[PDB]
Amino acid sequence: SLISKEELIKLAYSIRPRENEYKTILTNLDEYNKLTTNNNENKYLQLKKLNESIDVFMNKYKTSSRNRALSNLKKDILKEVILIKNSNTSPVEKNLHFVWIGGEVSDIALEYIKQWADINAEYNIKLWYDSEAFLVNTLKKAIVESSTTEALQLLEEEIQNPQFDNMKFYKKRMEFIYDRQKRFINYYKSQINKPTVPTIDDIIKSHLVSEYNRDETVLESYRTNSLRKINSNHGIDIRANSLFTEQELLNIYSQELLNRGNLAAASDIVRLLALKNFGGVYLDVDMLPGIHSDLFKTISRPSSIGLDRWEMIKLEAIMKYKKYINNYTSENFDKLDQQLKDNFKLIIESKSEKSEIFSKLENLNVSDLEIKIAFALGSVINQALISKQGSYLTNLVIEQVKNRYQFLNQHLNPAIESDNNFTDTTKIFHDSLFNSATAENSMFLTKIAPYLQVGFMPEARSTISLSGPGAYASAYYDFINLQENTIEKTLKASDLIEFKFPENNLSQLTEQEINSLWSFDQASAKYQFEKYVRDYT
Numbered sequence: 001s002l003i004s005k006e007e008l009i010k011l012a013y014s015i016r017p018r019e020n021e022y023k024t025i026l027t028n029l030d031e032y033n034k035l036t037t038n039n040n041e042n043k044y045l046q047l048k049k050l051n052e053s054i055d056v057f058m059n060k061y062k063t064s065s066r067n068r069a070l071s072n073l074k075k076d077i078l079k080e081v082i083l084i085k086n087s088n089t090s091p092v093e094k095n096l097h098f099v100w101i102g103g104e105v106s107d108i109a110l111e112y113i114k115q116w117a118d119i120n121a122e123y124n125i126k127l128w129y130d131s132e133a134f135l136v137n138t139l140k141k142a143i144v145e146s147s148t149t150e151a152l153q154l155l156e157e158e159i160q161n162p163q164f165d166n167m168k169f170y171k172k173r174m175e176f177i178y179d180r181q182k183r184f185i186n187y188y189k190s191q192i193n194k195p196t197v198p199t200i201d202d203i204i205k206s207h208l209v210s211e212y213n214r215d216e217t218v219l220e221s222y223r224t225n226s227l228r229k230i231n232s233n234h235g236i237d238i239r240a241n242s243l244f245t246e247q248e249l250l251n252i253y254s255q256e257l258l259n260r261g262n263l264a265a266a267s268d269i270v271r272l273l274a275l276k277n278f279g280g281v282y283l284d285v286d287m288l289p290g291i292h293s294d295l296f297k298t299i300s301r302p303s304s305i306g307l308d309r310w311e312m313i314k315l316e317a318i319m320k321y322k323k324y325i326n327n328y329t330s331e332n333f334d335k336l337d338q339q340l341k342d343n344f345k346l347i348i349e350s351k352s353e354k355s356e357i358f359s360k361l362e363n364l365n366v367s368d369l370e371i372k373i374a375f376a377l378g379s380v381i382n383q384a385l386i387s388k389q390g391s392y393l394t395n396l397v398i399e400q401v402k403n404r405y406q407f408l409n410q411h412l413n414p415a416i417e418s419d420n421n422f423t424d425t426t427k428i429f430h431d432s433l434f435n436s437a438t439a440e441n442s443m444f445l446t447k448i449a450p451y452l453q454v455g456f457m458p459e460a461r462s463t464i465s466l467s468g469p470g471a472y473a474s475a476y477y478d479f480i481n482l483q484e485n486t487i488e489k490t491l492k493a494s495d496l497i498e499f500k501f502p503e504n505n506l507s508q509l510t511e512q513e514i515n516s517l518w519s520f521d522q523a524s525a526k527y528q529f530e531k532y533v534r535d536y537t
Ligand SMILES: O=c1ccn([C@@H]2O[C@H](COP(=O)(O)OP(=O)(O)O[C@H]3O[C@H](CO)[C@@H](O)[C@H](O)[C@H]3F)[C@@H](O)[C@H]2O)c(=O)[nH]1
Pocket: 098, 099, 100, 101, 102, 103, 137, 263, 264, 265, 267, 268, 283, 284, 285, 286, 381, 382, 383, 384, 463, 464, 467, 468, 469, 516, 517
């Protein structure tokens, strides 16, 4: 329990009269100690109120003899949130949420989702999709491909020089991409208010037919096939549900889905709303169930192979003998000594049903305060999440996303609403953005400055700071330190063991996940550019 008001009076006793701010602290502490109710949120809020009062006294009387005790009390307050969070716990709602928006869900994604379904029959699979937006990927592809060709043609004389800086190509291509997105968006805005009430896909189809030499029948078949494939495999339509219950979040989802064509960012929004409204477990479609602990207890690992590769090899080894996922890679497993191999086959074949290989989720016991998250490379990663419906931390993350977008859009909207090309739009945005800089927000500003080229140029990673892991990391800071609207600071994986997605319940090092991580750094960028040059000729 926290120290009592009487104990604090004894500990902080001084020759000096009690300051008014000290009396307030004593009252807040006593009120926390006397709380009759068992509602976690109420306890947390009263903690917060007390912590805030202590800071007011410490800032005001910096040399006070009471500060040592009050400093200790703050440390005890930090421990209590953990205790509070860990004291009343119970199973999360039995929902597995997946999201696939913007096109046909792939067969490979369905296979991965199938593993989860087989192992966890009591959970109700929810594959969220947007019934009006099956052609967004098709459009983004068309725009990028056409732009790549335009940039190569413009730069044809230079691209052969082996010393050519491929960043001249990516910047020029971005100018063409921006012009093409802007043509689409202005066309969309001219259609969307018509009395025919067209859908996103109606408008994309028309635009592709008129400007990208496409065939309406082929696009319509692709769209209807996507709608049928998804509905047959646990699909649930965002347009027909209660995820979006305010305009602000919908506008954020729409700006990513329609203006940027950033499907991952749109999915970042949907997953939060799905957890807020329904609770359960959110998984990217490249995640796989966790391997039973004992399964490979009996297999020391060669020190030549890495801690992560060892996990990839365990998955590859399981597939090589059960074929649960068709054509699953065997590359890192084939290179092993036969006793290793023969040992793997031996333990593997020992088992009878898949539930002996992968672990069930069963009850995932969590606090209504928290959200649990996977880790990667020292950071949180929002590819796997656990949250009760309406959890306090899930709401903190949503608030972080809203505040970040409100700030982004304050500076971005005047620029994009201009009739200006990419270069001049970027200048208007940046001039506004960086005139707002402070010591607290400067890193954030620098990270969101390349927002418009996210997905199209190497090193544009603004999504992490808007809808992705950075927002979760700052919300964790908020929660742990009883703060709100943290922008400068993030908590790291080493800070968040109490919030880790339980290691035994998840396999992150799948073939599909490793396929996704191939990011847009300078190394990937050089390779894609070389292939573009290779194909152009
Ligand atoms: O065409 C598409 C492409 C992707 N999505 C959604 O985005 C999710 C993640 O995509 P993906 O794994 O390819 O990118 P990744 O770099 O790993 O995402 C991280 O960064 C992402 C953004 O912060 C984050 O969403 C993700 O969890 C991180 F791991 C995927 O499981 C879908 O829900 C889609 O619906 N349609």
